[PDB]
Amino acid sequence: MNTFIIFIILIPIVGFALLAVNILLAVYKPYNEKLGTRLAFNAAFILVAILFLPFDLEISTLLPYVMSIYLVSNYGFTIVLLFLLILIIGFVYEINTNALKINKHNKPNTDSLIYK
Amino acid sequence: GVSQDLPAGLLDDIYMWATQFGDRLDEIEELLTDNRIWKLRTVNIGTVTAQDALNLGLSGPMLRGSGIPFDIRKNAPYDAYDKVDFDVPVGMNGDCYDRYLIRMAEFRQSLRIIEQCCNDMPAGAVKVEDFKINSPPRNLMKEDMEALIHHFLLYT
Amino acid sequence: MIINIVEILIFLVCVLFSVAYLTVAERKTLAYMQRRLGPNFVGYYGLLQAFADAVKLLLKEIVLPKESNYIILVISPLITLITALIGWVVIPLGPGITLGELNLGILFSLAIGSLGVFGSLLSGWSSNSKYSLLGSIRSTAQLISYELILTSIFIIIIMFVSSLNITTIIETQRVVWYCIPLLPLLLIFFIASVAETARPPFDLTESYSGSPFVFFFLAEYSNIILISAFNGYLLLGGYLSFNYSYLFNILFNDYSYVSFLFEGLINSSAYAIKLVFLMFSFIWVRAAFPRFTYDNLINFCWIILLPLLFGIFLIIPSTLYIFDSFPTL
Amino acid sequence: PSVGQDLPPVGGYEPVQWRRNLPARGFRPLVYLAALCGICGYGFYRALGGIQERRELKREK
Amino acid sequence: DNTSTQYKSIIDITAVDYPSRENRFEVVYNFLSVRHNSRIRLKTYATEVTPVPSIT
Amino acid sequence: NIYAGGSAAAAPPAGFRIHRPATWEESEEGALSKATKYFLLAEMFRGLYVVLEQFFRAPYTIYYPFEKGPVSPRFRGEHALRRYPSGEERCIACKLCEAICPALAITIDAEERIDGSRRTTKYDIDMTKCIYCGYCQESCPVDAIVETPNVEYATETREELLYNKEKLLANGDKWELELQYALDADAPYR
Amino acid sequence: AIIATAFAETVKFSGSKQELQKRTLALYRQFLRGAPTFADLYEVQFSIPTIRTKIRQEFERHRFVDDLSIQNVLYAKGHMEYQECINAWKQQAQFLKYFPEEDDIQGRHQPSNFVDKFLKNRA
Amino acid sequence: RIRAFTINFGPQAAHGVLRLILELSGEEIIRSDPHVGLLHRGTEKLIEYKTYMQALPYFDRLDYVSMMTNEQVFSL
Amino acid sequence: PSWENIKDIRLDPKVHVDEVYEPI
């Protein structure tokens, strides 16, 4: 009965109304010419969304700390410092390995012109 | 030659245009030349070496993008490009960025041609002299028998 | 019960009008930046053109291809419409003026903003073509990659307040705004906000008809004004302009409905002027810049911005530590 | 003969601008960095002062 | 390849038919030496059925 | 001297040798100065401020059916067969406009009429295969067909767009006051 | 263009009649292997043995050609045709150039005799 | 066998009437193939049946953003 | 120093020849 839930139920009423208005209102009239295996992908594509999740789980692990920041003063501060640095080391692993690059397969072919 | 003579007051008008086009171009130059997004998008893109720019038969801004000093209006000149003084931009790395920079400079050089050609314009005929390859003027072919014959034959 | 439904349809009529006129505003200022007129053909000075376009596109033929889930393809518009619009509750137009005053408002605003990825990715599975998939892959990869640093900037700001309530942050910002100390964070948050909508500074995948188009269209600009609202409350002052106590002690003598009317006018005028300058800056950065390759974008987020953000994670609790300044609940 | 044509001036036109007019504008970068650090440090002054006041207010309540 | 010639750049190659000849087409080749600033042309012939060898 | 063979006076110019690119240590900018421009986006902001300046200036747009753009009298649009003073058709059927037309748009049949005067029985232009070179107007000794500066005659059928003798005589009727203005400024230059 | 297309062949001219017969039979095998992907690719009305009888018929047009150079030019044109058909470059409207006979009956009154050729003066 | 995925930059950033078959391995272009001829009209056959003055507009038809240069090369 | 007070160039003494000399 608050003004919070009329919103939750009323935004769909907005949408249901408008796509009704078009489906009820516009021409359908389709045909064949109007209508209409698998590819390979590089490793960094799947890598960005797989390694996305362990950083996201860290960001919501900071979320209990920054609400409790006064109560654990000088002590939970250092525990969080150690937590953050332990994960910064895995991040410097990740950017030292050049993991998230897609790198181009053709060079200028650097190898020189020798003879005989 | 040329189809017909200039209209009566156009030479005074191309000057008035050029005076402001000089700054209308620097303005376009500023949000691209040292834009870091425009830079990163074209720095090592489209690199052509100077030896295979010849083998592919490339010319103009793509051959001068690669370091080779060659353009026809300086090397094998024609149509009063001898009489007009200008310089030529030539890139060094074969990329899209130097092919961009030499166009942004050929703008400037063309404007230099325009003001030198408005200053140094002579009088005289604008078509070739004889009426056996292009037409007599309509003042003449309506009273001259020879010129009516030539006008009738150059068009049929 | 008359009171809250009249309040909510007042809020709905305001925000769903203002997302329509944002479209008319972007065309006109994109035109004047490009030294031409905007639309003046359809209103007295060009207005209700978004109405003209919506009137016509609700008359447009809907094509459901051979390739497609039909149900998935037309309710991905609605799930992106609904969660692009649900996040409009928690923003305050004044102290305690929201459609729901809940003590965890940033957690809600942060949970709804993660629900908005699906209607990209899911609608790639609509019209299953091999190029209709990996473009959606690049889209959703950029989307999640920049809502990471969005969430990060949020949690950096909550280190100063230690409360997930939103009007508590704005009342906390009365002593100083949060952009004035943390101005690099305003720059970082602006560019992450531009990425999170996939605006055409940071667009790659652009580079239907009818209802699945107008729902995506409305969701795009509702996301524009919603992340602008997020910037307005946690980084600029939310509804805060100046003190205005001396002006009131000149004008008024006691609490009346005209005094509360005047105070609400001042508060939401400050909030709206922040939001309007912010939307102008969105269109202004759209006008001036080319776009990104996917590799420039992923290199930008994961290799440049995120290590700097780790440095910010270390530096800001440490200065809250050096001077014994921890925020209390 | 030549009568009635478009001709240039007796002394010509005066020269137009064909050089790049891109003058280096702005302060030195260390001026902008010093101003940035000054603005940010003053904001941290006010923010940390306000947090300490809010803590004393919490003690009162 | 000769240092005197150095006709590096291919410019334009094409054919012209003269139907009154036994070998109907003649195939012309245009070359530019950007070093010595000089052009040259090379003309061979071809019937409709018989080939020319390719300089690709 | 005497040159080699494979050798003209086109030697390399004085200074065609590059200078070696500078390392990071032989640079006048400090690392702090250089990276302040890096992290504070300096020339991005410069190019931002350019278009911000352009927000505050006058647009170029003219309002088309209320305001037309440039006209020179030389300009070419639709066709017109003019008439003499005291009304005579001017087209003496000399076939020159047909002989010169680069896209073969003109077709004419010509017969001697009752007066013994030489006129066209049939004059015709296909405006779908016309290219507006103006050669038909340049060629005519009598100056019988001209180009009026009308471009606003866009049609809906192809049959409407095939102009016989009668449509072109009606055009040369209608636009004659205007073609006076065009040929008062063009006729010396022709 | 140093890399070439997938179903490319460096054009090469045979001094022997029999090695060109080898290449011709290999080409016929390539065509008839590719008849089902032609039927799927161009969305045709009919079924695959009509593509196969057209390939055989287009080869029995050119069986008694003697001169080796004319058979070389014929083989090169045929391989270019195969490369266009297999790579899905030709569209259905030009794939069905090969079947003018099959799409429809063009109407009545097919002139066979001298007189029904004469009544419409060959139209 | 790195199998390549094929698309076109079809006619409908292609500047109009170009077709460009690209063969990709993920992000990379391992093979390109421009198809050309969707604008080809046989102007070069048509010039042979016009006089030189009638053949003059065939030249500013082609490369239609730089007209006077196209006129100039034929006139020279 | 103004765009009001800028000189016109249409009012100018222009080049004028009696007769052009071009050798053949």
Ligand SMILES: CCCCCCCCCCCCCCCCCC(=O)OC[C@H](COP(=O)(O)OCCN)OC(=O)CCCCCCCCCCCCCCCCC
């Ligand atoms: C010494 C300074 C202080 C020291 C402390 C350390 C940092 C504190 C300050 C932090 C603030 C950071 C702001 C964001 C940093 C951006 C850094 C950057 O330039 O990215 C570089 C990146 C590519 O890097 P790279 O390949 O090396 O090439 C660079 C060319 N030199 O380039 C890219 O990938 C793309 C660059 C994108 C830039 C954003 C483009 C669109 C957004 C424009 C927003 C403009 C906002 C203006 C709004 C005005 C509102 C009134």
Ligand SMILES: CCCCCCCCCCCC(=O)OC[C@H](COP(=O)(O)OCC[N+](C)(C)C)OC(=O)CCCCCCCCCCC
């Ligand atoms: C709303 C809050 C955001 C405010 C924007 C951010 C703060 C401003 C920092 C950059 C500007 C600055 O102060 O730069 C100061 C520098 C000074 O350079 P100089 O000494 O003249 O160079 C001399 C070089 N010569 C010798 C070649 C000439 O450039 C300028 O004056 C240029 C004008 C800047 C206008 C400011 C833009 C906003 C316009 C509205 C006026 C307020």
Ligand SMILES: CCCCCCCCCCCC(=O)OC[C@H](COP(=O)(O)OCC[N+](C)(C)C)OC(=O)CCCCCCCCCCC
């Ligand atoms: C890691 C970076 C270290 C930087 C060190 C800088 C030294 C400055 C010392 C000035 C001391 C002072 O003036 O502080 C005074 C202020 C306000 O205090 P108050 O409420 O009035 O005191 C009340 C005392 N009672 C309760 C006993 C009455 O307090 C501060 O917190 C602000 C410090 C100045 C800005 C520091 C900026 C740090 C930004 C770091 C982001 C990287």
Ligand code: SF4
């Ligand atoms: S319009 Fe002119 S060129 Fe054409 S037939 Fe008449 S007089 Fe001759």
Ligand code: SF4
């Ligand atoms: S304008 Fe050119 S194409 Fe048209 S009718 Fe005249 S000569 Fe022919």
